[PDB]
Amino acid sequence: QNLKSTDRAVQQMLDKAKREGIQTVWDRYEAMKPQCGFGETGLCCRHCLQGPCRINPFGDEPKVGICGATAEVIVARGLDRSIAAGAAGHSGHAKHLAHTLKKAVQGKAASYMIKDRTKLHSIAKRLGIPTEGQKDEDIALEVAKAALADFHEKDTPVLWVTTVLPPSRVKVLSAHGLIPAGIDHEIAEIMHRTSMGCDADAQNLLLGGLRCSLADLAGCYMGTDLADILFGTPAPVVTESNLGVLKADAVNVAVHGHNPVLSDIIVSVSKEMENEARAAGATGINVVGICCTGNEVLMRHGIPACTHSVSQEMAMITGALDAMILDYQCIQPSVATIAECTGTTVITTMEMSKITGATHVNFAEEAAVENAKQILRLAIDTFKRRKGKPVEIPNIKTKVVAGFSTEAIINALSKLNANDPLKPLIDNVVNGNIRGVCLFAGCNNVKVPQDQNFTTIARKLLKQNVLVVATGCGAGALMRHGFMDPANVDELCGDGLKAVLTAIGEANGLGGPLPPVLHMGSCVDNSRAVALVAALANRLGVDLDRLPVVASAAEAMHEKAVAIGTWAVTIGLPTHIGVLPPITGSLPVTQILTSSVKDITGGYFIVELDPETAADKLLAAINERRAGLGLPW
């Protein structure tokens, strides 16, 4: 089971699933082998009813699609649709939050409120919305209206792109036609241009994809901004992760999916229902996180993370998961059938994300508290049904320090330099104590032994003094292996990085260092890394493609991760992907994405499946940036 996952708790539950005959994601993967090579390489098109069309990677016919579409066109169109799909998921997430904020300040959803007034005013200022002499509710109404306006064409471009990157970066992007006109406008344009008999030039198609990736960035940044207004900006917090956070004697409730509009209320309501849970024989309600919505409540409330991504089914195999509360994205639909075996009540809540065989409880922001109590009462009932049933919770957990929003990072640094908080970080990049920065992002993928790329790459980079930040299920992988526990700084970190983490921590009164990896939040919170990198660029007077900053989607899976990787390239970063995207069937497309895009945006993809080699390539990219700034490396 070590071929399947490097997580020991997951290995234990894989053994239980095997002896119980419960099929898992790894079993479904094995049954799919060998996978179709046309799809793997990108050389398949089903964009019209003359297909399916395929192209042999090598050899004889077929060499071209029925309509004449070349390998270049087919590969680029498929990639563009993935970017648009990722942007759409983030469109749905951010748009949800914008509607929630609007309703809240219109008096239509009293369970929600302006929790971070400071962030509200700073967003309004960034967007040009006047605040002096205005009621907070009116400022927030204007912010929500501005958010919704960025989904369509108007007399301004998407402000959640143009106001969040430095002017010089916006100028480079505008010169290449890459600034999005509206989030849903670009998604639709992608679907149009990639439909049969439309765009058929690889460079033109890929430029469209870069522009749609910025629409995805806008949705991410909008999601983070709105969630911080509504639920609070994260600050440092200490919690735990892995399956050992489940408690046999409690009602265990997992929040899984994406949006804090749902998971944040579940957290607060669960506290008010503790007595009702005790009357049912439990110690209380133990809310635990899966995937991004788990990250959201971990960052803001210290809710412990149960598991992530590929291993999500294993939480159910323990026998102790009384409910799994879902909204949308990254939920394996197998959970609905596994629940019949394990006793778990799987509950969907969003109209556009149902699963056959799961119970559906419409969640309306307007009735959030009452909907949450209905959901949690189903969980309590389920806990009662397992009275006296043995459970197998692996007694395995790590300590996790998290909550490093960009505001929190700036505040931590300000303890070393109050009025120039970014300077201590830059000073230590210059003197070599920090070699550079690497953002780990994205998913696990069943093709890769779970977490193996993230931990292998992270270990090499940390020993070379790289400051490592992480989001999403990359943060999940690193947290579940101790990379967010400051007790592991000595073992993991190079001397220079240890010195800096220690200096910052001691200045924040910790008597100890910051953790080896800084958790910057959920996948939309990749936007927080953008805010940090843009702030550094602005402080230095250079563009992002001159900074020693890289990204790694080391085990990528979802269309959202392709979108994120593409905007990382578009804003100027060397961006590693540790699984093969469906591009290898076209050398011209691969050459654009890994090489000639450098001349457009300064960023580029690094496709590398071997993690030791990927680490060397990321270090080379960092050191090339250092040399470009005239620094030793």
Q: Please give the residues from 477 up to 506 whose contact with ligand SF4 meets the rule CB under 6 A.
A: none
Number of shown-chain residues binding ligand FES (CB under 6 A): 6
**55 or 164: whose CB is closer to ligand FES?**
55
Burial class of 170 by CB neighbour count within 10 A (0 to 12, 13 to 18, 19+) = middle
The distance of closest approach from Cβ of residue 327 to Fe ion in the complex, given in angstroms and rounded to an integer, is: 11
When the beta carbons of 105 and 441 are compared against Fe ion, the nearer one is 441
Nearest to 345 by CA among 332, 355, 327, 358: 358
Q: Of these, 42, 65, 505, 572, which contacts ligand SF4 (CB under 6 A)?
A: 65
Task: Establish whether 306 is an annotated binding residue.
Answer: no
Q: What is the DSSP string of 416-455?
A: T-TT-THHHHHHHHHTTSS--EEEE-S---TTS-BTHHHH
Q: Is 325 in the site for a second copy (CB under 8 A)?
A: no
Residue 330 labelled as part of a binding site? yes
Binder of a second copy out of 503, 535, 580, 609 (CB under 8 A): 580
Angstrom distance (rounded) from CA 224 to CA 218: 10
Identified binder of ligand FES from the candidate list 2, 20, 50, 52, rule CB under 6 A? 52
Q: Both tokens of residue 161? A: 């792109």
How far apart CA 219 and CA 226 sit, in angstroms, is: 10
Shortest separation between residue 369's beta carbon and ligand SF4, angstroms: 34
Q: Are 109 and 99 in contact (CB under 8 A)?
A: no
| Whole-number Cα distances in Å, 498 to 493, 505, 620 | 6, 10, 21
Residue 36 annotated as binding? yes
User: Rounded CA gap, 10 and 523, in Å?
Assistant: 23
Q: What would the two tokens of residue 552 be?
A: 């790694």
Stretch of 416-424, 453-461, 515-523, 623-631 lying at the interface with Fe ion (CB under 5 A): 515-523
341 is in an annotated binding site: no
- Select from 66-74, 92-100, 156-164, 344-352 the region that touches ligand SF4 (CB under 6 A): 66-74
The residue whose Cβ lies closest to ligand FES is: 39
Burial 129-151 (b: 16+ CB within 10 A, else e): beeeeeeeeebbbbbbebbbbbb
CA distance 481 to 478: 5
Determine, following the binding rule CB under 8 A, whether residue 170 of this chain makes contact with a second copy: no
In the 8-state DSSP scheme, what is residue 595? I
CB of 112 to a second copy, least distance (A): 19
Determine which residue in the list 1, 48, 341, 427 makes contact with a second copy, applying CB under 8 A. Answer: 48
Question: How many CB atoms sit inside 10 A of residue 213's CB?
Answer: 28
- Residues touching a second copy, count (CB under 8 A): 100
91 binds, among Fe ion, a second copy, ligand FES, none (CB under 5 to 8 A by kind): a second copy
How far is residue 256's CA from residue 192's CA, in Å, rounded to a whole number? Answer: 33
- Report the 10 Å Cβ neighbour count for 209: 28
Which among ligand FES, a second copy, Fe ion, none contacts residue 593 (Cβ within 5 to 8 A by kind)?
none
Least distance to a second copy, CB of residue 188, Å: 4
Asked if 25 touches a second copy (CB under 8 A), the answer is: yes
Q: Applying CB under 6 A, which of residues 54, 81, 397, 481 lies at the interface with ligand FES?
A: 54
Count the Cβ atoms, other than its own, within 10 Å of residue 34: 6
Q: Residue 449 or residue 581: which is nearer to ligand FES going by CB?
A: 581
In the bound state with a second copy, the residue whose beta carbon lies nearer, of 325 and 425, is 325
Q: Is the peptide bond before 52 cis (omega within 30 degrees of 0)?
A: yes
Token pair for residue 284? 């209380």
What single string gives the DSSP state of each residue in 213-264?
A: HHHHHHHHHHHHHHHHHHH-----EEEEESGGG--TTSEEEEEESS-HHHHH
Q: Which amino acid is at 345?
A: T
Q: Which two tokens stand for residue 516?
A: 């080896």
At 368, list the tokens: 């959030």
Q: Smaller CB distance to Fe ion: residue 441 or 457?
A: 441
What CA–CA distance (Å, rounded) separates 262 from 444?
A: 24
For residue 523, state whether it binds Fe ion (rule: CB under 5 A).
yes
**Does 67 belong to an annotated binding site?**
yes
Omega of the bond leading into 581 within 30 degrees of 0 (cis): no
Residues 553-572 touching a second copy, rule: CB under 8 A, are 556-562
Tokens of 584: 């290898």
Q: Which residues contact 32 (CB under 8 A, 6 or more apart)?
A: none
In the complex, least distance from residue 344 CB atom to ligand SF4, rounded to whole angstroms: 21
Phi, psi (deg, nearest 5) at residue 228: -65, -40
Could you say whether residue 46 binds ligand SF4 (CB under 6 A)?
yes
The whole-angstrom separation of Cα 177 and Cα 186 is 12
Least gap, CB of 442 to ligand FES (angstroms):
23
Q: Which does 523 bind (CB under 5 to 8 A by kind): ligand SF4, ligand FES, Fe ion, none?
A: Fe ion
Site residues for ligand FES, 25-44, by CB under 6 A, read 36, 38-39, 44
Is 44 annotated in some ligand binding site?
yes
Which residue's entry shows tokens 């303890």? 415
Strands 359-360 and 345-348: parallel
**Selected binder of a second copy within 134, 334, 411, 414 (CB under 8 A):** 334
Within residues 274-293, the interface with Fe ion by CB under 5 A covers 292
Map residues 416-455 to x or -, x wherever contact with a second copy holds by CB under 8 A.
-----------------------------xxx--------
Pairing of strands 251-256, 237-241: unpaired
**Nearest to ligand FES of 73, 338 (CB atom):** 73
Minimum distance between the CB of residue 62 and ligand FES, rounded to whole angstroms? 11
Site for ligand SF4 in 67-96 (CB under 6 A): 67, 69, 74
Say which entry of a second copy, Fe ion, ligand FES, none residue 84 contacts (CB below 5 to 8 A, set by partner kind). Answer: a second copy
Decide if 627 contacts 436 (C-beta within 8 A): no
Strands 237-241 and 398-402, sheet pairing: antiparallel
Question: Is there binding between residue 459 and a second copy (CB under 8 A)?
Answer: no
Q: What is the closest distance, in whole angstroms, from the C-beta atom of residue 468 to a second copy in the complex?
A: 23
Q: How far is the CB of 167 from ligand SF4 (least distance, A)?
A: 39
Return binding residues for [4Fe-4S] cluster. 36, 44-45, 48, 53, 67
Binding residues vs ligand FES (CB under 6 A): 36, 38-39, 44, 52, 54
Return binding residues. 36, 44-45, 48, 53, 67, 258, 292, 330, 443, 473, 523
Binding residues vs ligand SF4 (CB under 6 A): 45-48, 50-51, 53, 65-67, 69, 74, 196
Return binding residues for [Ni-4Fe-5S] cluster. 258, 292, 330, 443, 473, 523
Binding residues vs Fe ion (CB under 5 A): 292, 523
